[PDB]
């Protein structure tokens, strides 16, 4: 009779897959960065995006082949994402519900996680365990209090 339990209950088993795949992801971390980063640099020179797959990469890339870069590069920043969904409880506990809801104080923390990966930083010297949080707790807070009193408050 519980979706929080659900979170358990299906991700309490989710692991971190270690931090080795960090570089396996790094390859993709970029690669995606690229694939877009081009494709909107190319939005940005012209056509505001021709909605063309090839333009999805400045360098040439057979449609299916590059279709493998994405999706694979994506599950990279998706599995690791789903993987790094355990310690998050720390932020939940530390911020209980912040006058909101335990869950909303973790789904808003999920807005973090993603806002880690991307600007998580590969070849750094340690996990976002000291950086992922960082976002996390800077993304919740911002919420929380943006969130919740039905009068927005300025932070000042």
């Amino acid at each position: 009779e519980d979706s929080i339990r659900l979170y358990l209950q299906e991700i309490g088993r989710i692991r971190l897959l270690r931090a080795d795949e960090e570089i396996e992801l790094a390859r993709k971390i970029a690669d995606l960065l690229e694939l877009e980063r081009v494709r909107e640099r190319l939005s940005e020179k012209l056509e505001r995006d021709p909605r063309d797959s090839e333009w999805a990469e400045a360098v040439q890339l057979p449609l299916p082949a590059f279709r493998y870069r994405l999706h694979i590069g994506r599950r990279a920043k998706d599995k690791m994402v789903q993987s790094n969904l355990r310690l998050v409880v720390s932020i939940a506990k530390k911020y209980m519900n912040r006058g909101l809801s335990f869950q909303d104080l973790i789904q808003e923390g999920s807005l973090g996680l993603i806002r880690a990966a991307e600007k998580f930083d590969h070849e750094k010297g340690y996990k976002f365990s000291t950086y992922a949080t960082w976002w996390i707790r800077q993304a919740i807070t911002r919420a929380i209090a943006d969130q919740s009193r039905t009068i927005r408050l300025p932070v000042h």
């Binding site: 931090a19 080795d20 960090e22 570089i23 590969h122 070849e123 010297g125």
Partner: protein, 395 residues
């Protein structure tokens, strides 16, 4: 009891458990559960180890030589170093520098390194004409990047069944219990084992696994608790705690004293000297209790008296009442109380008279209650109540 210090099979730099001639046989508890029988030899190559799977090319890892005598740079970690460094990259990124102690030498004259290979300087033999000082464990292979030799050190110590026996004397009350002293050492691990960079000051522990075997619990009080507690009359003056590691069968008996008008006065008696092995056949502890008023205690049962009910006779029990009436009743007439019951004069008497005929009655007290059929009983016969116990109910 207590945990001993045994500095031997310590060290202050890492390992290699390539030991010699100590022996457990593997026996699983080559582990805690440690056996330590035999080994005046621990051939061990302390070291540095850094299991940090990290991206390729962090700062710089350099094989073919030892980094720096003192804290050296590696790849954004540094080193309370002791020597040559197995450089340790493997799979798209590297994972665990294993530095192993000391001593480069400089193998040029190439034809050297494995030209003698898992043989070190046994202190006593020497290799290419170099004074043989101590155990220079030959680097398994050595010289990549070509010019620089290694045969590392070794370290070794003698540890027998027990390098130092403690006290080693102990007998107990033992009416069959069988207690024993035992100071087994303890062992970092066995050649299944390849050590890494830890305190390393942990390669021995002669604590006490002192046990107590033998069954016969009947006299062997708590065998599967043959298990220690230790107290303090040996604190000073024989200051050494007697270290019985004693067990206990402190049987608990209530005072059972209450002089209840049914339980009564309960007699307490012991035999405690400071301990006959529960005196085979003992006068351990007693509770003699007493029965209400005058009483031919009668048909009264075999001690346990599960049925606390006890047939028994007081002056009042037998109703003792003037039979001016002629000799008319006898050993157990059924008086249900009516008329002409004490013929001429009448009485209230009740239950089962054992006679009304010297003119003084015989009924042990009795009192009837008509009932019906329809019944659900409890009492049957020979049931001296106490009050309000349930008897034969009628639904």
């Amino acid at each position: 009891v207590a945990e001993l210090i045994d500095d031997r099979y310590r060290t202050t730099t890492g390992g290699f458990l390539k030991f010699a001639g100590v022996e457990v046989q593997k026996k699983g508890k080559a582990k805690l559960g440690y056996e330590v029988v035999q080994g005046g030899t621990l051939l061990w190559i302390p070291e540095e180890t850094h299991e940090v799977n990290k991206d390729i090319s962090l700062l710089l890892v350099e094989d073919g030589q030892y980094v720096e005598a003192g804290t050296e740079v590696v790849k954004d970690i540094f080193c309370q170093n002791s020597g040559v460094v197995e450089v340790t990259q493997k799979n798209d990124i590297l994972r665990e520098v294993v530095v192993k102690p000391g001593e480069l030498l400089m193998v040029d004259d190439p034809e050297a390194v494995i030209g003698r290979d898992n043989t070190l300087l046994q202190p006593g033999e020497e290799l290419l004409g170099q004074v043989a000082t101590e155990l220079r464990y030959i680097q398994y292979v050595e010289s990549p990047e070509g010019p620089a030799l290694l045969s590392r050190p070794v370290v070794e110590f003698a540890v027998p069944s027990n390098p130092d026996v403690p006290s080693t004397t102990s007998v107990s009350q033992q009416t069959g219990r069988s207690i024993q002293m035992r100071a087994v050492q303890r062992l970092p691990y066995k050649d299944s084992e390849r050590v890494k960079s830890v305190e390393g000051v942990e390669l021995l522990r002669t604590q006490l696994v002192l046990e107590i075997e033998q069954e016969g619990e009947q006299e062997h009080n708590a065998s599967p608790l043959a298990a220690d507690i230790e107290l303090i009359p040996d604190l000073e003056d024989a200051d050494v705690q007697r270290l019985q590691l004693v067990i206990l069968e402190s049987l608990v008996l209530r005072r059972d004293i209450a002089a209840d008008a049914t339980q009564g006065s309960t007699q307490t008696s012991l035999e405690v000297k400071d301990g006959d092995t529960i005196v085979p056949g003992s006068v351990v502890a007693r509770t003699q209790i007493l029965s209400k008023e005058g009483g031919i205690v009668r048909g009264v049962q075999k001690g346990s008296e599960a049925v606390r009910r006890c047939l028994v006779l007081r002056h009042s029990d037998m109703a003792t009442l003037n039979i001016s009436a002629k000799p008319k009743v006898k050993a157990g007439d059924l008086i249900v109380a009516g008329t002409e019951l004490a013929p001429g004069i009448f009485a209230e008497e009740s239950g089962q008279i054992v006679g009304v005929k010297n003119y003084a009655v015989t009924i042990r007290a009795g009192r009837p209650y008509r009932v019906s059929p329809g019944a659900v009983l409890q009492i049957e016969d020979g049931d001296l109540v106490q009050r309000g116990d349930n008897l034969v109910l009628l639904v």
